[PDB]
Amino acid sequence: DSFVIRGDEVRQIAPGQTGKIADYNYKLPDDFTGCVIAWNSNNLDS
Amino acid sequence: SALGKLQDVVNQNAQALNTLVKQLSSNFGAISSVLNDILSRLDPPEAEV
CB A9 within 8 A of CB A19: yes
Q: Is the separation of the CB atoms in A28 and A6 below 8 Å?
A: no
Residues constituting chain B: 49
| Structure determination technique employed | cryo-EM
Q: Which B residues, 30 through 49, put their C-beta within 8 Å of a C-beta on chain A?
A: 43-45
Distance CA A46, CA A6 (A): 12
* Resolution given for this structure, in angstroms: 2.8
Helix, strand, coil shares of chain A, percent, nearest 5, are: 15, 0, 85
Residues 1-46 of A with CB under 8 A from B: 15-16, 18, 30
Separation between Cα atoms, residue B46 and residue B29, nearest integer Å: 13
Cβ atoms within 10 A of the Cβ of A13, count?
Answer: 20
Number of separate helices (H) and strands (E) present in chain B: 3, 0
Q: If phi over 0 gives left and psi between -120 and 50 gives alpha, with beta otherwise, what is residue A9? A: left
